[PDB]
Ligand binder design. Structure first.
Ligand code: DAN
Length: 656
């Protein structure tokens, strides 16, 4: 039970002395503090409480828990005379505002001198636990004489003044156990996660959210389940899905939808320290960056990039499709172990052919790229990962089918990237086996890289359009036969853009592709013939981002706003990083120019905001899922439970 509990303490920098209440309560020196608070101003460094030596010369002798204006939660524990200075923290731990209101967060700190660890919790998640060599509890700091809410008394002055309301604050004179404190910090923020660390997927990490609303009124999500931290590469990544049959209120437990099993779907504690965060899973095959579209006949497509083990955006040969042309048909090449050339193709029924003799072999390749010999599966041992800061990838005794995308395969595909698609006839309950896309860029070129989010059906032609990019060009993958066959329009860009794009239709036959660039701006290209030819790029005047850029989301909206047809855009908007998420409403004019009339800031401007996805809910509200952190920063790698789902009414989005 609490040694002290206070409530509804509103403050604006000044703090409140509780020295009389807490002096003499902390017998061992260990402590737990749980704080339910909301901020009225996020600016500056703010302490939720402070325990200090207030006397002159002793300003580096204190304990506190602090909040930064970018959502970082941390704690310090410092002693002047021994020059001991502990700082434990994690970025992107709290929420600032939501729809014009200060957000209530619940955070906690645990100091355990037996373990020599400081632990921090926020909103149901243990955001960090750190064993420290120079551990300090309250009794270890010389001359503690001052205990304060909403600041730290340093040399008789109030430092780090907190602005807001401490709704409830509990001080305990012992280290409370992990599961209790997780429970105490659980609140409404906790329930905005669809995908959670070590849920049904087995993944501790997630990135690249996608939302889509189907014609039947189901709302559907896909996401990258990234098992080896959040690294784009190298990594072990599956695509997970989850859906809602009630306008987004409740969601199904996540299922794996695209996955390889050369590594198992298991939780790994990826090291965040500078010395380990660069580590990667190197040996594992991957699906990455999903795109969803619903056809006119209500069948659903999902596309994803496919990386064989060892291959990424970085390693993939750019000069080979992985396909061969034989009598006007395209067939995937394979290289057998011990050969240097690619002497084999996969042809009809998955039969592996020796191209030299033009004869079928005894080998075949199944619908999931698994290898058979005489109609029986070849096997390989699955890998596990183990730590200590010593990472090892090792064979674990479990047998899985040998696969042409694996490290230990007898027959291997060219080490480049591919695109695969799967189809569903039951709005995402079940999915067909993956089909690899044919060499639409040419035989001597790797496939493009998907622009995550959604594709579209252009209404005047029924053309299906899937966005992708090469690093130098936009690659608009399309089908004019309701998805039976695919072509591409390649459009050279002004520079080396990572041209992650999304489409909107302005009017029949007129589409725009809005995309990331390498120049700091969002570009948009216009076609007035349903995607066949594209104008020169124009740029939005009101977004200004770092040169590297970030993925965006833009969707058509079904209902009139101010009597006009509308589009809705989600993007970060800050030259300081992947920060300052905004939702913009653009109203289409009769001449097909857009009036960008409204914008809404999702949280405060220094809070993290990376990849995002929008959908129109059946009730005509808006669903938003996004990466509430900076996914470019090397400081914000390998963080759990940082991809929330939130919703807006149009009237909410009109404000800011
Ligand atoms: C296929 C792949 O690697 N996709 C990744 C993409 C890509 O590497 C970049 O476009 C190269 O320029 O980068 C990012 C990113 O947050 O910046 C996320 C994607 O998951």
């Amino acid at each position: 039970t609490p040694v002290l509990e206070k409530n509804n303490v509103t403050l604006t920098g000044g703090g409140e002395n509780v020295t009389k209440e807490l002096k003499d309560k902390f017998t061992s020196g260990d402590f737990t503090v749980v704080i339910k608070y909301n901020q009225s101003s996020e600016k500056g460094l703010q302490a939720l409480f402070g325990i200090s030596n207030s006397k002159p010369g002793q300003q580096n002798s204190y304990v506190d828990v602090f909040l930064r204006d970018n959502g970082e939660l941390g704690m310090e524990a410092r002693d002047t005379s021994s020059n001991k200075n502990n700082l434990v923290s994690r970025p992107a731990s709290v929420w600032g505002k939501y729809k014009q209101e200060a957000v209530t967060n619940t955070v906690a700190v645990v100091a355990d001198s037996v373990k020599k660890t400081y632990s921090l919790y926020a909103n149901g998640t243990k955001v960090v636990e750190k064993k420290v060599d120079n551990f300090l509890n309250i009794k270890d700091i010389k001359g503690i004489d001052y205990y304060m809410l909403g600041g730290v008394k340093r040399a008789g002055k109030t430092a780090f003044g907190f602005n807001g309301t401490l709704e409830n604050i509990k001080f305990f004179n012992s280290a409370l156990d992990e599961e209790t404190v997780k429970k105490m910090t659980t609140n409404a923020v906790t329930g905005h996660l669809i995908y959670t660390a070590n849920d049904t997927t087995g993944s501790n990490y997630f990135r690249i959210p996608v939302l889509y609303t189907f014609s039947n009124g189901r709302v559907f999500s896909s996401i990258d389940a990234r098992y080896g931290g959040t690294h784009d590469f190298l990594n072990k990544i599956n695509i997970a899905t989850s859906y809602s049959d009630d306008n987004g209120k409740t969601w199904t437990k996540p299922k794996l939808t695209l996955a390889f099993d050369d590594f198992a779907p298991v939780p790994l504690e990826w090291p965040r320290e500078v010395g380990g965060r660069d580590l990667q899973i190197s040996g594992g095959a991957t699906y990455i960056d999903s795109v969803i579209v619903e056809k006119k006949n209500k069948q659903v497509l999902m596309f994803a990039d496919v990386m064989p083990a060892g291959v990424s955006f970085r390693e993939a040969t750019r000069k080979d499709s992985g396909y061969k042309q034989i009598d006007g048909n395209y067939y995937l090449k394979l290289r057998k172990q011990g050969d240097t050339d690619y002497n084999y193709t996969i042809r009809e029924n998955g039969t592996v052919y020796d191209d030299r003799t033009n004869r079928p072999t005894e080998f075949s390749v199944d619908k999931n790229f698994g290898i058979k010999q005489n109609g029986n599966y070849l096997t390989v041992e699955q890998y596990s990962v183990s730590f200590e800061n010593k990472k090892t990838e090792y064979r674990n005794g479990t047998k899985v089918h040998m696969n042409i995308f694996y490290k230990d395969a007898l027959f291997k595909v060219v080490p480049t990237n591919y695109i695969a698609y799967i189809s569903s006839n039951d709005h995402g309950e079940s999915w067909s086996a993956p089909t690899l896309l044919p060499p639409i860029m040419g035989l001597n070129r790797n496939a493009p890289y998907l622009g995550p989010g959604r594709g579209i059906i252009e209404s005047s032609t029924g053309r299906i359009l899937i966005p992708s990019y090469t690093g130098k060009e936009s690659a608009f993958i399309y089908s004019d036969d309701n998805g039976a066959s695919w072509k591409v329009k390649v459009v050279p860009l002004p520079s080396s853009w990572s041209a992650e794009a999304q489409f909107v239709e302005l009017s029949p036959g007129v589409i725009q592709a809005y995309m990331r660039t390498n120049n700091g701006k969002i570009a948009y290209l216009t076609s007035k013939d349903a995607g066949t030819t594209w104008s020169a790029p124009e740029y939005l005047k009101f977004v200004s981002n770092p040169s590297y850029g970030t993925q965006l989301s833009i969707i058509n909206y079904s209902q009139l706003i101010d009597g006009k047809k509308a589009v809705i855009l989600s993007t970060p908007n800050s030259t300081n990083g992947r920060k300052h998420g905004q939702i913009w409403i653009g109203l289409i004019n009769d001449d097909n120019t857009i009036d960008w009339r409204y914008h809404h800031d999702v949280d405060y401007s220094n809070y993290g905001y990376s990849y995002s996805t929008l959908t129109e809910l059946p009730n005509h509200e808006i669903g938003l899922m996004f990466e509430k952190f900076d996914s470019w920063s090397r400081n914000e790698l390998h963080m759990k439970n940082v991809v929330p789902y939130i919703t807006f009414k149009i009237e909410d989005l009109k404000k800011n």
